[PDB]
């Protein structure tokens, strides 16, 4: 039941919080999530041809 | 729950005393000791792990057919093929050039 | 009084070398037929680090003129020598970095490493990370050659004494501040048990001719005599001058 309200976003206020934001969820983790996604959207648009390879190669380094 | 004990008398975490956990048909967990891992044999020329060759701890190679200990071509399971290609070409050339050295100085000994 | 520290180092108990990780002792080829009538070829098969040693060794293998087999020698690698490099060793050998030639057969000014005091002693002078010797002289009658060592000291030895062309690798190692006790610690950890160092002046008099007193002081001249006796020689043994070497150095 608790876990339900948890995943219902409850009991997660500033006052139910004892580890630093970093420690709760690594900034780095967020990044790797984020980046790997951009990285591989790029890949499929390339694989499709929705995007060309040159524009892809810019966006990659741009991402 | 359900922890596990070492199955042998040695009680420490030495390389030769790794443990793996396992569910028996009894429905319980049990330690099981785990031999150190084999390493791939290496080319004596360059040094890469050489392919084709089965990878065993060294005495396990005594009970395995000779085909797990070689690839076909000369210097079978001993050098790395690209490493043998190198040999052959060099062999040929050096042996060729050797001739170019003889006949040239044989000309020197007549033209001096 | 107590036997002092420098007297104890002698019986080599906790004081002997740390040996264990060592590559082997660095030596020139034995002075055989080949090396003194002609030259013989090897390949540096590997240049390699020797624990507690400044400069890299060079594993260099040769054919055995008398038995079908290989014999591997261990060289101190001169700078610029590389794996695969062919290495020539002998009287009638040519003058390139890495080769090993009898000090006789090299023109004055030549620069060589690992040079033999006597011929065939397989290399004694100039082996440390950076050092070398330079031929300054050549006297055919009683065939000697004169070199200047790294110390500055000039010495005359026989022309047949061998040396290797070039300077030893890993130079400039001593330019870098150790920075901390640890780097030093780890340094001596692969040499010998000489670190760290208590000052005699912080010991009690049992311990040292510098020990004791109500303030820390040497209390008598610290320049000890040559003829001093064991347990006496601590401080500046045989010193003939002392103090900040004002002035240029170099050996005129």
């Amino acid at each position: 039941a608790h876990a339900q309200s948890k995943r219902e976003g409850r009991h997660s206020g500033y006052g139910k919080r004892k580890g630093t934001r970093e420690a709760r969820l690594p900034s780095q983790v967020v990044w790797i999530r984020r980046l790997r996604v951009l990285r591989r959207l790029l890949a499929k648009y390339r694989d499709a041809g929705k995007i060309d390879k040159h524009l892809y190669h810019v966006l990659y380094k741009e991402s | 729950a359900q922890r596990v004990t070492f199955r042998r008398r040695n009680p420490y975490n030495t390389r030769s005393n790794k443990i793996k956990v396992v569910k028996t048909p009894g429905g319980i967990l049990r330690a099981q000791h785990v031999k150190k891992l084999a390493t791939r044999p290496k080319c004596g020329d360059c040094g890469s792990a050489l392919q084709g060759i089965s990878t065993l701890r060294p005495r396990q190679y005594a009970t395995v057919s000779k085909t797990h200990k070689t690839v076909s071509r000369a210097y079978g399971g001993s050098r790395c093929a690209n490493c043998v290609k190198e040999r052959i070409i060099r062999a040929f050339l050096i042996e060729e050039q050797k001739i170019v050295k003889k006949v040239v100085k044989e000309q020197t000994e007549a033209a001096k | 009084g107590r036997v002092i520290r420098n007297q104890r180092k002698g019986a080599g108990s906790i004081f002997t070398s740390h040996t264990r990780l060592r590559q082997g002792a660095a030596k020139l080829r034995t002075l055989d037929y080949a090396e003194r009538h002609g030259y013989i070829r090897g390949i540096v098969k590997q240049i390699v680090h020797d624990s507690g040693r400044g400069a890299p060794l060079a594993k260099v293998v040769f054919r055995d003129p008398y038995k079908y087999r290989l014999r591997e020698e261990i060289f101190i690698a001169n700078e610029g020598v590389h794996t695969g490099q062919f290495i020539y060793a002998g009287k009638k050998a040519s003058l390139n970095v890495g080769n090993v030639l009898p000090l006789g057969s090299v023109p004055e000014g030549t620069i060589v490493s690992n040079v033999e005091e006597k011929p065939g002693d397989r290399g004694a002078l100039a082996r440390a990370s950076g050092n070398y010797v330079i031929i300054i002289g050549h006297n055919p009658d009683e065939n000697k050659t004169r070199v200047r060592l790294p110390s500055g000291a000039k010495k005359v030895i026989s022309s047949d004494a061998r040396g290797v062309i070039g300077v030893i690798a890993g130079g400039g190692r001593v330019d870098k501040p150790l920075l901390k006790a640890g780097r030093a610690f780890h340094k001596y950890r692969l040499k010998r048990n000489s670190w760290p160092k208590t000052r005699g002046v912080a010991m009690n008099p049992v311990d040292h001719p510098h020990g004791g007193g109500n303030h820390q002081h040497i209390g008598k001249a610290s320049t000890i005599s040559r003829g001093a006796v064991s347990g006496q020689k601590a401080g500046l043994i045989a010193a003939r001058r002392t103090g900040l070497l004002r002035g240029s150095q170099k050996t005129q």
């Binding site: - | 076909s72 071509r73 000369a74 043998v84 040999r87 052959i88 060099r90 040929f92 | -």
Partner: protein
């Protein structure tokens, strides 16, 4: 010249027959659905005649001089074109595309080639071609 031609000798440089010397007997200079690359059909020597000596007598010389041959389709990119060259006329027709595929035909092909290589060797023709390349 388009030098990978009619009787050019070469050293196989990859595969089971690596280091062995051959004779190019027919070049497909380009093409083959089957073999989509520049490649040659070669007769070669697999088990060289082992050195012979004055001590060697009678039927031992007989043995020592036996050759085991082979025949290969092989990529140009796997030969070392040699300066040397050896005649191929006695087994022009033996070694062919048709020869390869159907083992039964390969086997016969070798039989000929073997006789050819073994006559050749006595009367010391082409001696290089029977001197195993050491490496």
């Amino acid at each position: 010249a388009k030098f990978l031609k009619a009787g050019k000798v070469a050293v196989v440089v990859r595969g089971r027959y690596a280091g062995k010397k051959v004779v190019i007997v027919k070049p497909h200079d380009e093409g083959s659905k089957s073999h989509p690359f520049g490649h040659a059909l070669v007769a070669g020597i697999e088990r060289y005649p082992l050195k012979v000596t004055k001590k060697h007598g009678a039927k031992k010389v007989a043995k020592r001089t036996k050759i085991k041959p082979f025949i290969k389709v092989v990529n140009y990119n796997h030969l070392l074109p040699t300066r040397y060259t050896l005649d191929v006329e006695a087994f022009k027709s033996v070694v062919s595309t048709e020869t390869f595929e159907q083992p039964s035909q390969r086997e016969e092909a070798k039989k000929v080639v073997k006789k050819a290589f073994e006559e050749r060797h006595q009367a010391g023709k082409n001696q290089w071609f029977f001197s195993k390349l050491r490496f």
